[PDB]
């Protein structure tokens, strides 16, 4: 099985113990590390942070301590939008320009592949033709990587993609049968399935539906999303289940109503290191659990939640990671991807569970080491 671990090039700016750079990664935990994110300019891949080139080298230097480790560079993401992707795939000329720049970029800076993180073809302003043109891009990229590999005597560059976990986005964005033929792996973003945008509490990445859920609400679980991809043309062995090392936060309208579906108000509280409303890293969650919070096991969905006064948290822990790891193995899936390794308790000083408790749980459960 594969354990694919995303690293983010803005984590370096978190204060104090939150600051995370490539040298903080244990090179033996994962089979693949993915660098989030590269940008694009004039249909060519490019850096985004002032020190990306330095971080690239430290990132790929991790392979000096693990002969099996592979690295990839992710391009795009949520804030990147869709407009540059729409322009780049619109013509064969622009796709060739981009693909050519990618091969040169990855080989110069030491990456073993590219992870396409377009959010999303056919949505967020992307026109309908991008559903098919995305397949063309991946096909042309896979073929160009294959050519470069056989001519250079080097292992072929990987082409992967982070893909939507929302059914509406999936249907508008991906030709699953043909796309799955050319991607090496399909990293399914089976998280952000509930959050403060809904106005009530819900789990970030529940494995199963809540018992009373019907209709489109019954889409919002890992089991449904993964089986959607599998049953609509994707081979199970290429499908990678998304594992969040963070949770989503809410403000309860009434602290006395603190179950699943309890009413909530604004965007949710922010954490002292990630400093973004609605979002807590796992190491920030451990601090919350030690501040007097009540812990509850969501038995139907196989995930935890916790609350204290007016704050409510839906999240993942060792127990839920273990349940999902066993589940994905018994469903013949390709492994797990983690968003993101800089959100684990990488110092070990927050959770009293050792270093990288969530990532290590998957390392052991997936037979990585
Ligand atoms: C694949 C993807 O788009 N994942 C999202 C992350 O990008 C989000 O992180 C946020 O990313 C922006 C752009 O780099 C940063 O400016 C922002 O600080 C960062 N916030 C945090 C807490 O890391 C993430 C949270 O919004 O949601 C997805 O994971
Ligand atoms: C399954 C699904 O499509 N859920 C949607 C969420 O993804 C989305 O949340 C946003 O997700 C982005 C990654 O895809 C994050 O970068 C972004 O921070 C996050 N926005 C938040 C937490 O406010 C929400 C809100 O846009 O919609 C869901 O439908």
Residue numbers in the entry: 22 to 390
The authors write:
One of these proteins, Acidic Mammalian Chitinase (AMCase), is an enzyme known for its ability to function under acidic conditions in the stomach but is also active in tissues with more neutral pHs, such as the lung. AMCase is a member of the glycosyl hydrolase family 18 (GH18), the members of which hydrolyze sugar linkages through a conserved two-step mechanism where the glycosidic oxygen is protonated by an acidic residue and a nucleophile adds into the anomeric carbon leading to elimination of the hydrolyzed product. We found that mAMCase has maximum activity at pH 2.0 with a secondary local maximum at pH 6.5, pointing to a bimodal distribution of activity across pH. Mutations Lys78Gln, Asp82Gly, and Lys160Gln result in the loss of surface-stabilizing salt bridges in hAMCase and may contribute to its reduced activity at more acidic pH. It is likely that the dual pH optima of mAMCase is intrinsic to the catalytic mechanism, where Glu140 can be protonated directly from solution (at low pH) or through proton shuttling across the catalytic triad (at neutral pH).
We also directly observed conformational and chemical features of mAMCase between pH 4.74 to 5.60 by solving X-ray crystal structures of mAMCase in complex with oligomeric GlcNAcn across this range. Across these different datasets we observed complex ligand density in the active site of mAMCase. Across these different datasets, we observed ligand density for different combinations of occupancy over the −4 to +2 sugar-binding subsites. While modeling chito-oligomers into strong electron density, we observed strong positive difference density between sugar-binding subsites near the C2 N-acetyl and the C6’ alcohol moieties. Using the non-crystallographic symmetry (NCS) “ghost” feature in Coot, we were then able to observe that the positive difference density between ligand subsites in one chain could be explained by the dominant ligand pose observed in another associated crystallographic chain, suggesting the presence of a low-occupancy binding events. This observation led to the discovery that GlcNAcn occupies intermediate subsites, which we label n+0.5, continuing to follow the nomenclature established by Davies et al., in addition to canonical sugar-binding subsites. During ligand refinement, we observed density for both the α- and β−1,4-linked GlcNAc2 anomers in the active site. This unexpected configurational heterogeneity, which is observable because of the high resolution of our datasets (1.30 – 1.95 A), likely formed as a result of equilibration between the two anomers through an oxocarbenium close-ion-pair intermediate. By modeling GlcNAc2 as sequentially overlapping ligands in alternative conformations, we are able to visualize each step in the proposed catalytic cycle of mAMCase. When the −1 subsite is at least 50% occupied, Asp138 prefers the active conformation (up towards Glu140).
